[PDB]
Amino acid sequence: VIGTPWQKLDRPVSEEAIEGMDKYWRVTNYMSIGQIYLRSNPLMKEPFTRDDVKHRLVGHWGTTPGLNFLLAHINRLIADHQQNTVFIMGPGHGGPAGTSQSYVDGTYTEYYPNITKDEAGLQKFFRQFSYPGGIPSHFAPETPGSIHEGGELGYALSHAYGAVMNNPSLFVPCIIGDGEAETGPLATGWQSNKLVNPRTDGIVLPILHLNGYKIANPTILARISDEELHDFFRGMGYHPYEFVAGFDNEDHMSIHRRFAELFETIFDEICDIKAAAQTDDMTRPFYPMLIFRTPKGWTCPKFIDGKKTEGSWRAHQVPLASARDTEEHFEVLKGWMESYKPEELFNADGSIKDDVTAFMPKGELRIGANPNANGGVIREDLKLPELDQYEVTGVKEYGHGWGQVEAPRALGAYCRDIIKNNPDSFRIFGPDETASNRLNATYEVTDKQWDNGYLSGLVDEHMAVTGQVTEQLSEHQCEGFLEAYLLTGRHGIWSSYESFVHVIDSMLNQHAKWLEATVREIPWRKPISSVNLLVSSHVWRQDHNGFSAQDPGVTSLLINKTFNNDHVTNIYFATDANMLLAISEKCFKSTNKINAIFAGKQPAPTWVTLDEARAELEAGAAEWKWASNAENNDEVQVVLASAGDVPTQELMAASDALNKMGIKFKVVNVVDLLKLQSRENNDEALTDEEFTELFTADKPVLFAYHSYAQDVRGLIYDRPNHDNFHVVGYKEQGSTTTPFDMVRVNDMDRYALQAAALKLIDADKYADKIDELNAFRKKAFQFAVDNGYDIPEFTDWVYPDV
Amino acid sequence: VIGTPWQKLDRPVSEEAIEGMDKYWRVTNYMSIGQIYLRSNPLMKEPFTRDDVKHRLVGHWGTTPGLNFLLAHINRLIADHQQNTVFIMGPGHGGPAGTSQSYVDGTYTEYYPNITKDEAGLQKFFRQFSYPGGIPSHFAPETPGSIHEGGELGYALSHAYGAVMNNPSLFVPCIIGDGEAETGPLATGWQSNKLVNPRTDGIVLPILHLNGYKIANPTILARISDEELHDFFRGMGYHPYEFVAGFDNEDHMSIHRRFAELFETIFDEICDIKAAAQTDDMTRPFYPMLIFRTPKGWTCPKFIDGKKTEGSWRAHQVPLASARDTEEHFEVLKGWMESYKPEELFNADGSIKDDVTAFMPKGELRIGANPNANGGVIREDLKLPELDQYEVTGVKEYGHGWGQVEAPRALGAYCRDIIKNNPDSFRIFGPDETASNRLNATYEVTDKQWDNGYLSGLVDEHMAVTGQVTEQLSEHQCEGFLEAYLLTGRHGIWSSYESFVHVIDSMLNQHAKWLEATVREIPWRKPISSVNLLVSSHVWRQDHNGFSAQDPGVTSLLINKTFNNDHVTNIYFATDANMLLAISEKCFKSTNKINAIFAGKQPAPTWVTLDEARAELEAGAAEWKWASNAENNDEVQVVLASAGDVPTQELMAASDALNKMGIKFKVVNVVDLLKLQSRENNDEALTDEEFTELFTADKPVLFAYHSYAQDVRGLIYDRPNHDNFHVVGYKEQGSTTTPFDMVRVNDMDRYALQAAALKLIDADKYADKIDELNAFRKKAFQFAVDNGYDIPEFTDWVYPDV
Numbered sequence A, B: 001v002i003g004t005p006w007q008k009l010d011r012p013v014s015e016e017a018i019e020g021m022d023k024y025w026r027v028t029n030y031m032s033i034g035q036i037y038l039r040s041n042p043l044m045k046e047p048f049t050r051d052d053v054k055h056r057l058v059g060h061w062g063t064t065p066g067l068n069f070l071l072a073h074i075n076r077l078i079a080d081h082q083q084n085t086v087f088i089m090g091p092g093h094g095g096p097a098g099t100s101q102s103y104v105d106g107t108y109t110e111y112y113p114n115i116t117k118d119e120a121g122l123q124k125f126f127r128q129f130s131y132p133g134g135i136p137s138h139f140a141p142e143t144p145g146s147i148h149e150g151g152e153l154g155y156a157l158s159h160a161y162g163a164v165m166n167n168p169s170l171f172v173p174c175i176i177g178d179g180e181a182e183t184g185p186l187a188t189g190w191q192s193n194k195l196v197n198p199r200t201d202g203i204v205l206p207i208l209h210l211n212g213y214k215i216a217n218p219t220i221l222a223r224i225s226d227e228e229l230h231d232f233f234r235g236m237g238y239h240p241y242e243f244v245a246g247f248d249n250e251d252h253m254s255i256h257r258r259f260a261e262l263f264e265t266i267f268d269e270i271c272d273i274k275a276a277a278q279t280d281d282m283t284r285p286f287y288p289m290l291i292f293r294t295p296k297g298w299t300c301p302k303f304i305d306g307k308k309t310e311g312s313w314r315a316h317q318v319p320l321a322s323a324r325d326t327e328e329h330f331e332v333l334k335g336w337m338e339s340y341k342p343e344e345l346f347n348a349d350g351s352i353k354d355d356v357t358a359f360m361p362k363g364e365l366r367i368g369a370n371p372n373a374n375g376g377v378i379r380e381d382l383k384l385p386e387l388d389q390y391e392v393t394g395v396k397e398y399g400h401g402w403g404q405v406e407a408p409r410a411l412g413a414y415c416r417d418i419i420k421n422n423p424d425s426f427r428i429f430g431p432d433e434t435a436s437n438r439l440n441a442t443y444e445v446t447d448k449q450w451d452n453g454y455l456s457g458l459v460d461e462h463m464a465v466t467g468q469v470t471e472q473l474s475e476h477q478c479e480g481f482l483e484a485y486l487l488t489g490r491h492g493i494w495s496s497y498e499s500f501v502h503v504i505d506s507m508l509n510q511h512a513k514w515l516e517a518t519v520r521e522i523p524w525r526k527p528i529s530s531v532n533l534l535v536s537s538h539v540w541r542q543d544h545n546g547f548s549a550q551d552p553g554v555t556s557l558l559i560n561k562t563f564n565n566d567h568v569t570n571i572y573f574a575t576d577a578n579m580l581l582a583i584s585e586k587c588f589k590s591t592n593k594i595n596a597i598f599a600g601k602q603p604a605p606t607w608v609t610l611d612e613a614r615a616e617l618e619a620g621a622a623e624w625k626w627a628s629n630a631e632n633n634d635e636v637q638v639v640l641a642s643a644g645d646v647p648t649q650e651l652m653a654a655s656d657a658l659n660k661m662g663i664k665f666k667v668v669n670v671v672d673l674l675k676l677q678s679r680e681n682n683d684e685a686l687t688d689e690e691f692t693e694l695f696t697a698d699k700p701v702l703f704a705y706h707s708y709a710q711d712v713r714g715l716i717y718d719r720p721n722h723d724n725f726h727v728v729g730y731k732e733q734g735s736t737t738t739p740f741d742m743v744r745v746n747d748m749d750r751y752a753l754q755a756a757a758l759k760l761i762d763a764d765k766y767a768d769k770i771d772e773l774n775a776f777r778k779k780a781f782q783f784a785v786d787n788g789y790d791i792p793e794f795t796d797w798v799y800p801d802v
């Protein structure tokens, strides 16, 4: 247990704590301006001149003194209450507030021994911010206390709420930009309080950093009337409190006392809500939220060159852009830095004075040190059930290609028993699609957690106020809740209809970038569990929906995060349920990855045994010798290769026909896509030798690909024999139609694959047969048109091994 | 002017209109069930049997009878008030409601002459829904009355609001799913009422289709308390009204009268708001919104096999899935269809009776016929100013590579004069980034439209209650407002920081799919203006931000919509301002496209004259003969090729060094990326002959690419000489650093390009020089580290022609 969770003070905040908070605020404002402006001379020792100012002024002052003031008060709160706490910096461009926090709490020097607590360390701390060879502009993963960089705005609240799930002792004050609040993801984020339980989950306190402005505009929320603003948050299930400071001549000490008192009233109400939830965990309370309204750029000069800067969008980036170039800008910088009175905050050796930090929390309650902000320190391996009990044994008993199994059903039974073994640290998310993607075997041991109105057992099923599945119709919520759940040391999976995964393409990008920085250069930030995404209800079988739901191209996005041997991204094609089981075990064991697991949910053949899936997954691509009819590679007229359940089914049917014509070929299945890249681009891929062994040195290769052929063509550009691959993929053809028609219109059906194989071998010799196959595809289509269902010879085909 | 806009009735709704609305509701429910279930015998003529039921039951009943009831009342409203109206079907899976609407209003038969108004047409209308060779499951672009398919949920409100911009006579009732309302994009969509003006824009009426459920869960908004729900909409600036029906034994006629009365009160208030805005266009009113609460699946059987179906998520997809296979399901289907009493609604010939549609609007007020739902019918070419006046003439006067121009500034001056010439039909959108991306010359003739609080001329600048620029910190709002603005016949552009474009990747996918269906097979849906997206503040020069803001991969998404010679997608690299001008003119003239226009906003060289840009843009790729030093292609030791402003600058500097070493080469610039594809994949690309002419038959090609090298490798896979291209692209390396460092870490800087060129020509001979170049890159880096700015020999270089 960290600290003493949800304890009230029962006395006023001490005047000593008010004094330290003002000193914190002044020292973090001062060091924040130092990080932005100063390359040397951090204490302004004589001579202090323009030569000390950075040549390239980059950074964001505007948000920063607001963050610094909140951080003083959140630090004071943590310490007085001993409260386990992670904050979220929505406006992550306020990096200097976050580095200053860690430098003051002592974690910066603990993690970065060269940045010491004295004048030399402070000079280095100022210079390195946003500087070549130094550190980033934002609250990046390399800053102690970050689980959220806030570079791409919008995810503050899904992360805050994912962090408190199953984390009942954790408090998360979540600082949200008022511009950030104009984004879609942030706006739906407010509703998460219907999806957490105040007894079994922790508590988020949204703090709206209502500073009036974004980059070059006021914000929507700051300019609506106060009655609308309060109604809005009340309507989303919060008790709104509002603080206003900085707009008049109120002295700073008075402002600190009034905020501290307010913040104690808010926390008292959170403690009452927590105590009450021990007895009534079914009534959803109105959680407090804080409207925090202060001038943007607070404490900077009011006017610069006749333009209002404090209390304006003009404070957003870098005031006094000429600080190095004109004595006029320099003098204003100098008076601004002096207004904090650093001579009272730093000792002669340049260390921050003891009376500046005596109010701060210590040890693992420090914001930089808490293990929830470095969740790999808390993470334990899942207790995984034995995979063998889930195997589809129909392949072993009856033959390759047996049965009509819905593949994700085996993964659902497996996830069911993972939750049973790990009952408060593995969660499932779904955007109203968990049952639709066939993961509902999980409801045998848990419920969809819903903390909002109930009506009747006639409609409410597999749903309770507490449980380990969470659904909301929002891919942004699902992805963001899960990320933070992982970042705080836990595990899970979510599932999505495949074309809708693109809603969160840019979230996958940010979390891949977080992983990239971390695996490269932040070894103190320990491995977290991987994002595991079941990508199902795919392009080939969107039976109730249509062309709008046909887009497997998240493959292509993910290919753009496969650099530097980072190995943070995996694309897997689950050929059947036994391959799906083998992939899922690997993904559930992996760390520091995004794993995209493609699988069809339609009734389909099972091709491999589980032991075969385990060996084939490890190689990445495998020959299916029991399907090939060629002696060796020299005897091969064509390589039949596929990735995806549907392309595989169709290729396999094509191989059966080609066998029957006396064509010689081998069958290669591809599961781990990126293992096709060259060793030069991927030091864990197939060696050129294993790759030639699979695909031959010079025979034609027909490659039936689940997604866009572009992907495979780009990946194998420097592989031996690449000029002989003919990649057939999805080509933006389809509609609401039968399963044969969907593969037909993309030249993916067995008949078109058989034809392409013939074309590659001898187009002249096979002209007539190709014609007959093209004509059969028209007959099969007409049959679907006339009759309402696909031609039996298509639907009824089973691989000859069964 | 369409109809008589914003007129009140001043009498009750007639009892005749109530009677017709009930008949409409019954006939559209009946035909909706017919579309889902029946392959033949639409009037249930003896014998009516299971043989008449479809073999594959696909579709969505649940939302549909709610849509049908709203559509009856919206039709009644249009007719009584003669009100110019487009509706939005948020729950676009309710396609049958939308096809039924067009079939009843007469537009279906007008557009589809084979689907006639009689028993034969009705049989064909039922069979073709969601059927091979037939029509889609959703409210697709092929349905008259659609500007919004609603397949991917979330964009209902941005589209409704983009539609009414500059459209002061248009009324848009916007039907929103209660599950859809859980998405991020929908949730921020409610706030658009701060960004429209009630005098110069039209009016949206949000209607929340509060049916209690999404696919397999209740919805958040339906289960919160009524006080929270009303506070929420009041807080977002609406006057909420709430209608509740269907949960008890109230007779349908009474329900219609109570709704009609309510809907007249709402419209009266909209008319008062419109009249008032003629005098006070500065006070933002509280626009009505409608909470519409009715049972999901309304009018279907209450229980099926002991399970509650009406008033449940169970009504979502297809009730009675065994209708063809069991006499028990069949009998329930039969009684359900009979409950609408079709014998009263259809004549013996199968035509819909006159008393069913006498209340309907006529002519161009019909929902299927209104030209706003087919905006290409309204669209006119922009009055474009002459491009020559914007040219950067420094190239002509001083030489290729002259100056320090910020390229989008020329596009801003051009957009300024386009708004001046087309003052109410060209809009600019930006997610708080219009000025940041340098398009602010537009503010010389118009303002950012802001209909929310004002404070002071000290902070409010270039902002008024009416104007042709719209900003909100949300890429979803910007993209969705613009799409509908285009779909209703108008024009514009938006701009985005490049990595944040990925927020709306899935919106680009949907609009590309809308364009694909339209160019292929809906010739009555006339061309609309193109989406024009200035993609700037790019991966190479995100000076104040960092690794998080470094992602040029929307190129890769767009490559997945380049099929079938649809030609709906363009990727352009603006080499400089004069190329940007030539691209922009072309995009502003184009129709039926998404145009992604890449340009840097940093100070940069101008390479080509405007006349040169115009010729080079048309070819797609061009040799720069004045930069090449080789006689002919046989004399060429390496092809120096680039796409992007930054890669071009660095390649050019490399060419200067290579010239000075006596290396022979040609320089090729690439602007229209997809023109690199083969003719087989793109019938408008460079022919193999023009391509070989540019890139040679067999010399090595160094290709410096702005985005991920994957893209170019996949595109040129079947081109002559592709094996000799070495593509250098962005490789997930960078941080907050100097401009040289950013190109350095990706091997993109001039020195690394010079080295790669040498390596490709003779690695052995040039070993030492390569080493010296790699060492110079380290020295330049160290210099940035030590000094705070890049080495002058790097920054101060100007191409020798100046």
Ligand SMILES: Cc1ncc(C[n+]2csc(CCOP(=O)(O)OP(=O)(O)O)c2C)c(N)n1
Binding pocket: A062, A063, A091, A093, A151, A152, A153, A154, A176, A177, A178, A179, A180, A181, A183, A209, A211, A213, A214, A215, A219, A296, A316, B431, B432, B473, B497, B500, B503
């Ligand atoms: C999704 C997204 N779009 C655009 C941006 C560009 N951007 C970086 S900061 C900023 C303004 C943020 O304003 P606000 O949230 O009010 O933060 P403040 O500095 O006022 O605290 C913008 C638009 C972004 N970071 N993320």
Ligand SMILES: Cc1ncc(C[n+]2csc(CCOP(=O)(O)OP(=O)(O)O)c2C)c(N)n1
Binding pocket: A431, A432, A473, A497, A500, A503, B062, B063, B091, B093, B151, B152, B153, B154, B176, B177, B178, B179, B180, B181, B183, B209, B211, B213, B214, B215, B219, B296, B316
């Ligand atoms: C962005 C997105 N995610 C997921 C889906 C999958 N989906 C299609 S309909 C639906 C439920 C919609 O419920 P609601 O909006 O309440 O509409 P209803 O049928 O109740 O009117 C879902 C989740 C989608 N269409 N779009």
Ligand SMILES: [Mg+2]
Binding pocket: A177, A178, A179, A209, A210, A211, A212, A213, A214, A219
């Ligand atoms: Mg702000």
Ligand SMILES: [Mg+2]
Binding pocket: B177, B178, B179, B209, B210, B211, B212, B213, B214, B219
């Ligand atoms: Mg609903």
